[PDB]
Amino acid sequence: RELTVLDLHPGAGKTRRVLPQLVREAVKKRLRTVILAPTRVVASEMYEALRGEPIRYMGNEIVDFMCHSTFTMKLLQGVRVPNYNLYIMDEAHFLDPASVAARGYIETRVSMGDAGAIFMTATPPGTTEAFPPSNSPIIDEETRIPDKAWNSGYEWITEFDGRTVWFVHSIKQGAEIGTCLQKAGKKVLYLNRKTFESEYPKCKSEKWDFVITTDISEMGANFKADRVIDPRKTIKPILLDGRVSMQGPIAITPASAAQRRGRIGRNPEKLGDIYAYSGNVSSDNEGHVSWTEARMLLDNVHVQGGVVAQLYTPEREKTEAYEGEFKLKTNQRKVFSELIRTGDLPVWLAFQVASANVEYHDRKWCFDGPNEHLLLENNQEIEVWTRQGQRRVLKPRWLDGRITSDHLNLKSFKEFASGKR
Numbered sequence: 001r002e003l004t005v006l007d008l009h010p011g012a013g014k015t016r017r018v019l020p021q022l023v024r025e026a027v028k029k030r031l032r033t034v035i036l037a038p039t040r041v042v043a044s045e046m047y048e049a050l051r052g053e054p055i056r057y058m059g060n061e062i063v064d065f066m067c068h069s070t071f072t073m074k075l076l077q078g079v080r081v082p083n084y085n086l087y088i089m090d091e092a093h094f095l096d097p098a099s100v101a102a103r104g105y106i107e108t109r110v111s112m113g114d115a116g117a118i119f120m121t122a123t124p125p126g127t128t129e130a131f132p133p134s135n136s137p138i139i140d141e142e143t144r145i146p147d148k149a150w151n152s153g154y155e156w157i158t159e160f161d162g163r164t165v166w167f168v169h170s171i172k173q174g175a176e177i178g179t180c181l182q183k184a185g186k187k188v189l190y191l192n193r194k195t196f197e198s199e200y201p202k203c204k205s206e207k208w209d210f211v212i213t214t215d216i217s218e219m220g221a222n223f224k225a226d227r228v229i230d231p232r233k234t235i236k237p238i239l240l241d242g243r244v245s246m247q248g249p250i251a252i253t254p255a256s257a258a259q260r261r262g263r264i265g266r267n268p269e270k271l272g273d274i275y276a277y278s279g280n281v282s283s284d285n286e287g288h289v290s291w292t293e294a295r296m297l298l299d300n301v302h303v304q305g306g307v308v309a310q311l312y313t314p315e316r317e318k319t320e321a322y323e324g325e326f327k328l329k330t331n332q333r334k335v336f337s338e339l340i341r342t343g344d345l346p347v348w349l350a351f352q353v354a355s356a357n358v359e360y361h362d363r364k365w366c367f368d369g370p371n372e373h374l375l376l377e378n379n380q381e382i383e384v385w386t387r388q389g390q391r392r393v394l395k396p397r398w399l400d401g402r403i404t405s406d407h408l409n410l411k412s413f414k415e416f417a418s419g420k421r
Contacts, residue, residue: 001116003107005092010122010262011135014090015042016049022118023053023063026086031116033063033086036071036102038094041196041220043067046090069098075105075301076337083304085115091219092119093255095285097293097347103312104298112306122262123255126314130254130281134265139274145231147173147249149180156276158184162226165211167218167260169233169249171406178212186210191217194408215252218259226272230260232279235405237346239289243399244348251282291318293347299326300333328354335360342421344412345400352398366417369397377404387419 008014019035026033035055037043046065047057058066064082068089074081087106092099103125109115122132131140146154157164158181168174171192178188189199189206191213203211203223211223215234234256235248252260257277264273285291291311298309299321308323310316328336332354339350339360358365363386375382375394382394382404394417396403403413415421 003110003117003119005119005124007124007127008120008122009133010259011266012122014120015045018120019046019088019090020049020053022088023050023055026063026088027054030062031085032082033088034071034082034084035063035065036068036087036089037065038068038091038096038099039220040067041200042090045220068094068096068102072098072101072105072297072301073337073341075101076297076333077341078302083114084109087115087117089117089119091121093121093123093125094219095253095255095288095290097290097297100290100294100311100315101297101301101309103315104294104309105301105303107312108303108306108309112303114305121255123258124314125312128254128281128283130257130261132258132262134262135268136265136270136273138261138265139272140261141274141276143276143278145229145276145278146177146180147231147233149176157181157229158186160227162272163209163211163223164227164229165213165217165223165225165263166229167213167215167231169214169231169235171214171408174212174214178210181210181212188212191221192408196220215256217263218256221263222266223263224267225264227274227276228260228263230257230275230277232257232260232277232281236285237289237348237400237402237405238287239292239348240287244289244346244401245399246401246405251280253283253285254281257281286318289346289348291315292321293351295319295321296326296336296347296351299324300328300336326351332357343416344421345416346402349396349398349400349402356397361419363417363419365397366413367392367395369395369399371395373397373399375404377410382410382414384414384417386417392417 037046054061056064106117110117178190181188186209188210189202189208191199191211193216232252233249234252235246237244238247261275336350336354339345339353373395384392402409404410
């Protein structure tokens with residue numbers, strides 16, 4: 001039937017209350033259903049909320065549940081995916097290109113009349129409110145926030161008896177801020193994609209004064225906190241002159257800012273909660289490779305009885321690509337899908353390699369580019385050791401700034417270039 005968008009503000013219980021209602025209805029109506037979580041952590045949260053329900057996690061069951069990226073990767077790999085009657089997408093504002101492609105694919109099956117869909121999120125695509133409702137009033141305090149260690153000033157930060165979640169634009173920024181806070185006698189927990197599964201539980205089992213987080217905590221994380229500090233900065237990959245570069249710190253989106261603030265003001269009986277913020281929000285993000293990458297994904301997804309999925313309607317404004325531009329042949333597509341899935345390469349970079357007819361196991365492109373593609377970290381080249389073992393430096397045929405944007409990306413690419421994956 002229909003694509004229903006339910007805007008439900010942070011704390012409204014999308015997962016804990018609304019999702020079970022939706023599931024019970026779909027089970028009763030005998031609708032063949034998929035539930036799409038943005039992350040593995042949300043996935044487990046949903047599981048807990050949905051115990052007893054006949055759900056298939058990725059008896060008999062007509063309801064499946066998996067991540068956005070799993071969904072669109074299955075579609076890319078051409079492994080059969082059910083012709084679901086109902087698609088429920090959680091956190092449908094998520095800008096990960098796999099989420100953007102899933103939206104477009106889902107809206108297509110709806111427009112073709114194969115299915116109905118429900119998109120859930122506080123901040124629907126096309127909408128722009130940085131200060132959504134909350135369970136309890138939030139004090140919004142525009143203020144000056146340090147971007148680095150400080151020796152003096154900023155006493156509003158440290159003279160605070162409650163718990164604060166501070167969003168940083170990078171793991172690196174988090175280390176320098178967190179360390180300054182620890183030197184000031186504060187107990188800090190660091191949350192990023194490396195540290196999350198072990199450190200996040202500690203937010204419940206330990207006493208803490210600050211959580212220093214990257215944007216990983218914008219959706220997957222519930223804190224019992226009194227304050228969020230949010231400089232509203234990110235670093236984003238921008239496509240320019242046939243290469244991807246990290247540009248920032250730049251303003252975050254209204255959706256992200258709403259998610260960040262949405263960490264507090266969630267107990268109806270608790271009034272003191274503060275959102276201490278600085279800077280603007282921005283929807284000017286067409287330069288972000290993310291949108292190009294969505295099209296690279298979607299151009300390579302088959303739709304039975306239909307044609308190339310366009311992006312979700314309010315997101316079509318984000319790209320100027322023509323239908324089928326990024327479509328690959330069968331074998332290039334396999335390479336492309338595995339460069340992403342197993343290689344852990346960013347989508348745009350995987351695309352460059354695959355469309356150049358490079359085979360998946362052939363890593364020579366990681367070393368034989370022009371000198372202008374010499375990768376640097378801490379201002380120095382990165383010497384690696386391939387499968388045979390002698391002196392090569394990282395210098396890819398195609399330049400994607402994400403390779404060296406943090407230590408997790410760099411280590412993953414060194415492993416890839418060495419032929420480990």
